[PDB]
Amino acid sequence: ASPFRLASAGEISEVQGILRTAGLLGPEKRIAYLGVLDPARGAGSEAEDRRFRVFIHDVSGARPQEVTVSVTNGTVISAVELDTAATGELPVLEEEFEVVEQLLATDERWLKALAARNLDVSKVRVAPLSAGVFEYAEERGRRILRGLAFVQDFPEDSAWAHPVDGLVAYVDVVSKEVTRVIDTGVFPVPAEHGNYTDPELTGPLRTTQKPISITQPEGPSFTVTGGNHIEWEKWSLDVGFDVREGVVLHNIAFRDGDRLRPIINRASIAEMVVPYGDPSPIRSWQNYFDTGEYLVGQYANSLELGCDCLGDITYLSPVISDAFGNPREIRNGICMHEEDWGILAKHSDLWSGINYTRRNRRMVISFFTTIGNYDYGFYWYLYLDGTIEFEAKATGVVFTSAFPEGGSDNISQLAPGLGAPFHQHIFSARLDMAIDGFTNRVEEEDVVRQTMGPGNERGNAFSRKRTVLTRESEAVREADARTGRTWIISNPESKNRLNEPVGYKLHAHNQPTLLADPGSSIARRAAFATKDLWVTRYADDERYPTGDFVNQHSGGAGLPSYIAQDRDIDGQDIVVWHTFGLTHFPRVEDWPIMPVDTVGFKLRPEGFFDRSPVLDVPAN
């Protein structure tokens, strides 16, 4: 009966029915986004109202709509026509992915370009790439995708090995017109294949790996009730799923003795962007907001046992809407398991004679998505000791180009004539905090060095300082690894037994933030990515650091607009937005398929508990 339960097939079909009945979902309509809304603050006391938010596209060229439906009551709560030139285009539709290649294949300019390079049009794949917002006035108010070409020599060939540089096209996917074809000149199309299952490239497969068997003869240490409520080693949470954000954690809390103590109300990856650093006009417009533009949840993989998730795995199979409002299940789309995590605590004491060792474990909740060439694993970890961690695992095939004769400051070489433009993958974690409840504040904590002198005669002392972030205008912060900078979220009205406010400390990896010039389009559209930490006052309509409609949407929405309100965040219901990313200068080792690389963050208890929370963990 939890209001945080996953959407069921029935609820989605019911949203479909309500929209149909209301005249909002005729044959020209397509659902670009559909997701359940979280319960309002203080809604637990009142009866439940399951509400769904829907973005409806119209293939005949009519304006799209944003609609909220109450599936409980069978009503339309609100329906509003969107002016996309102002507020943004809807997310890219699944069905639009083929359209770019299809339209280009009969366009005389495109055909001329391919003929100049002696490429068979039947073998040319075209990626359906988000367009962003640049200097082309005609694109304002139109759904545009840009196309980059890759040659596929045969059906099972990896087209990424054969980029067609010097060529890009722009297409209106509603009116089904090619608006521009730009050919800056021929580059050699790299010839080596990148087929990582071809024995000629792999060589003989290793026979040297012996089996590793991970089993649980009595089953897992966690329970699942109500479909998605997890209880494990004092932790309690609900595992949600949204087609945009993917796996979302709700109501993260820890049972400390008799009391269920909230820590985080909602945790999600609310945006992720992949900005490219190649100034060639063929790619200088390239910034993929995988979450906001493409919707990472919708492309979640079905995860196979013993391959993707190893051990005793409990799967969730989230349901999403197709383009017509019919439910579609992502079978085994979410993995849940616990795993051993080495030593938790250990001491062999000379004076007492007592030797003590305890093992750690973590609960893992994950999914894996595929966005064109990229594949990303999103992992949330809960540890016995109260630590919470996120990790992103980046793999797939690197996005390629030609490698210029004479080299490049912005592209690395992977194979003869084959380049990989420099880029970043930058995530925003939205952490709606609830440290012992909703009354929270954030402090920035720096190490403080001290000068040798009076009070510090041996020059050994060091200290720290904490600065409370009192209003949103003061709450846009940068990393300082040299001074060990962290951010503590505390509850000023909840004290531990030592009379100190309870808290959690966020530990960042301090990787570089967005590198683009601050005057670029991407610096405005991904403003969140320019700073490591933002704190806002909670509001129900402030969901994404980039706003609701990212596709072809200029600056104007998202975090810079939210913080302008300059709201009180000193002992209030607040939200932390942490930017973290990977800066990728591709290496030869990344080709032809990339080994996983990782980035993330964690939060550790900081005077939250009255002593170690794992004293009751048993031996062996």
Per-residue b/e over 393-421, b at no fewer than 16 CB within 10 Å? bbbbbbbbbbbbeeebebbbbbbebbbbb
* Residue 356 known to bind ligand: no
Binding string, 483-522, against Na ion, x = CB under 5 A? ----------------------------------------
CA 262 to chain centre: 24
Name residues contacting Na ion, limited to 90-129 (CB under 5 A): none
* Closer residue to Na ion, CB minimum distance, 436 or 573: 573
The option from Cu ion, its own copies, Na ion, none interacting with 615 (CB < 5 to 8 A, set by class) reads: its own copies
State yes or no: residue 235 binds its own copies (CB under 8 A): no
Name residues contacting Na ion, limited to 530-559 (CB under 5 A): 538
Q: Which of 1, 458, 540, 541 forms a contact with its own copies (CB under 8 A)?
A: 458
Name residues contacting its own copies, limited to 29-88 (CB under 8 A): none
* Residue 288 known to bind ligand: yes
The option from Na ion, Cu ion, its own copies, none interacting with 433 (CB < 5 to 8 A, set by class) reads: Na ion
Per-residue b/e over 308-320, b at no fewer than 16 CB within 10 Å? bbebbbbbbebbb
CA dist 42 and 186 (Å) reads 62
Strand partners, 223: 231
213 CB neighbour count, 10 Å cutoff:
7
* Shortest CB 591 distance to Cu ion, Å: 12
CA 428 to chain centre: 7
Count of residues engaged in binding its own copies, rule: CB under 8 A: 152
CA dist 358 and 617 (Å) reads 7
* Shortest CB 329 distance to Cu ion, Å: 30
* Shortest CB 260 distance to Na ion, Å: 17
List the alpha helices (DSSP H) in 383-498: none
Instruction: Name the nearest CA neighbour of 102 among 184, 159, 178.
Output: 178
Name residues contacting its own copies, limited to 243-262 (CB under 8 A): none
Q: Which of 348, 467, 561, 572 forms a contact with its own copies (CB under 8 A)?
A: 348
For residue 290, give the amino acid letter: D
CA dist 389 and 180 (Å) reads 45
Q: What is the DSSP letter of 459?
A: S
Residue 67: how many CA atoms within 13 Å on its side-chain side?
A: 28
State yes or no: residue 467 binds its own copies (CB under 8 A): no
* Shortest CB 94 distance to its own copies, Å: 11
- Taking contact as CB under 8 A, which single stretch among the options 31-39, 55-63, 164-172, 347-355 is the one that binds its own copies? 347-355
Q: Which of 432, 445, 542, 548 forms a contact with Na ion (CB under 5 A)?
A: 432
Checking DSSP bridges between strand 533-537 and strand 388-396, what pairing results, if any? unpaired
* Residue 574 known to bind ligand: no
Cα end-to-end span (Å), the chain: 37
CA distances from 69 to 8, 29, 53, 54, 350 (A): 15, 16, 7, 8, 67
State yes or no: residue 482 binds its own copies (CB under 8 A): yes
What torsion, rounded to 10 degrees, do the Cα atoms 604, 610, 611, 613 define? -60
State yes or no: residue 283 binds Cu ion (CB under 5 A): no
Q: After which residues is the chain broken (C to N over 2.5 A)?
A: none
The option from its own copies, Cu ion, Na ion, none interacting with 60 (CB < 5 to 8 A, set by class) reads: none
* Closer residue to its own copies, CB minimum distance, 269 or 479: 479
State yes or no: residue 345 binds its own copies (CB under 8 A): yes
Residue with token string 């002198």: 453
State yes or no: residue 338 binds Na ion (CB under 5 A): no
* Residue 372 known to bind ligand: yes
Name residues contacting Cu ion, limited to 577-606 (CB under 5 A): 584
Name residues contacting its own copies, limited to 259-298 (CB under 8 A): 275-279, 284-285, 287
Name residues contacting its own copies, limited to 528-567 (CB under 8 A): none
State yes or no: residue 370 binds its own copies (CB under 8 A): yes
CA distances from 389 to 116, 246, 260, 287, 601 (A): 52, 16, 20, 27, 6
Secondary structure string (H, E, C) spanning 217-236: CCCCCEEEECCCEEEECCEE
Q: Which of 149, 171, 181, 415 forms a contact with its own copies (CB under 8 A)?
A: 415
For residue 601, give the amino acid letter: F
State yes or no: residue 517 binds its own copies (CB under 8 A): yes
Residue 274 near residue 425, CB atoms below 8 Å: yes
Binding string, 314-343, against its own copies, x = CB under 8 A? ------------------------xxx-xx
Residues marked active site are found at 290, 374
Q: Which of 155, 225, 258, 406 forms a contact with its own copies (CB under 8 A)?
A: 155
State yes or no: residue 210 binds its own copies (CB under 8 A): yes
* Shortest CB 74 distance to its own copies, Å: 38
* Closer residue to Cu ion, CB minimum distance, 362 or 423: 423
Q: Which of 77, 85, 461, 468 forms a contact with its own copies (CB under 8 A)?
A: 461
CA distances from 219 to 229, 276, 319, 583 (A): 17, 45, 26, 40
* Shortest CB 123 distance to its own copies, Å: 11
Q: Which of 243, 415, 433, 516 forms a contact with Na ion (CB under 5 A)?
A: 433
Give 354: exposed, middle or buried? Use CB within 10 Å, 0-12, 13-18, 19+.
exposed
* Closer residue to Cu ion, CB minimum distance, 360 or 554: 360
Name residues contacting Na ion, limited to 561-590 (CB under 5 A): 573-574
* Shortest CB 82 distance to its own copies, Å: 27
The option from Na ion, its own copies, Cu ion, none interacting with 573 (CB < 5 to 8 A, set by class) reads: Na ion
Sign of the CA dihedral running 494, 499, 504, 510? positive
Count of residues engaged in binding Cu ion, rule: CB under 5 A: 1
Helix (H) or strand (E) holding 561: helix 559-563
Residue number, nearest CB to Cu ion: 584
State yes or no: residue 122 binds its own copies (CB under 8 A): no
Spell out the residues 6+ positions from residue 54 whose beta carbon is closer than 8 angstroms to its own: 15, 19, 31, 33, 34, 66, 67, 68, 69
* Shortest CB 438 distance to its own copies, Å: 23
Annotated binding residues, written as ranges, equal 288-299, 371-376, 423, 425, 584
Binding residues for substrate: 288-299, 371-376
Q: Which residues are annotated as a binding site for Cu cation?
A: 423, 425, 584
Task: Give the footprint of Na ion on this chain (CB under 5 A).
Answer: 432-433, 538, 573-574
Q: Contact positions toward Cu ion, by CB under 5 A? A: 584
